Amino acid sequence: VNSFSGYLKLTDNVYIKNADIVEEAKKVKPTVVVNAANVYLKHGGGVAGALNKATNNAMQVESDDYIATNGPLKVGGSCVLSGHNLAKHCLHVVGPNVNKGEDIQLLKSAYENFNQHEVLLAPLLSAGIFGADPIHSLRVCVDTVRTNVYLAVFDKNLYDKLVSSFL
Ligand SMILES: CC(C)(CO)Nc1ncnc2[nH]ccc12
Ligand SMILES: [Cl-]
Structure with missing residues (x-):
């Protein structure tokens, strides 16, 4: 039993709800919230911009240090950083951005990152x-x-x- 509420059950393990992920994370404080990240962890807009704004830019500050140390992520890849005031952890996952010409086949690789975590709150990867x-x-x-x-x-x-x- 977990504290997620109002979801429609699609399969044994996938649930869905019409909700603002920022407001959901603040309410539930999940162990893991997924960010719709890019390889540079520049959280300018979309889900990333909204999550970062809700952290008062602390997500961006932490992310800039991560990139300075480690370099960019891979498309299809991820990293675990702090969830700040929204969650214990944030799993930053890079789906392909079709508006950049990136291979949509990498979407499966992106979702595979979720399997390293028992429970996650997430947006749809590569949407928006x-x-x-x-x-x-x-x-x-x-x-x-x-x-x-x-x-x-x-x-x-x-x-x-x-x-x-x-x-
Ligand atoms: C990724 C997509 C298209 C569907 O999951 N958009 C979002 N989903 C949930 N919360 C959100 N906050 C800001 C944008 C956004
Ligand atoms: Cl979006």
Whole structure:
């Protein structure tokens, strides 16, 4: 039993809700919140910009030190950093950004990072400003993640489409 509330159950291990991931994380304080990161951990917009804003820019400060030490992430890769005031940990995961010409096949590799964590709050990878079809992202999630994932979809219209189109 966990404290996530109001989710629709899609499969044994995948759950979905129309919610603002920032407000969800503040309420639940999950062990792991997933960020829709880029390889530079520049959290300028989309989910990343919203999560970073909610940390009063502390996420960005920590991220800049991480990059200065380690260099950029790989597309499809991840790193674990602090969750600040939102969660114990933040798993920064880089899905492909179609608006950069990145291989959509890397989306499965990106979701594989979730399997290193028993329970996660997450957005759909490569959705929104990363330019992929959120319906496809949900399919890859369900077919790749085996741990317990609570998906937050900001747009109510899109949420209804993902559910009503979910196979
Ligand atoms: C990634 C996508 C398209 C669906 O998960 N968007 C979001 N989902 C949840 N919280 C969010 N906050 C800001 C944007 C956003
Ligand atoms: Cl977005």
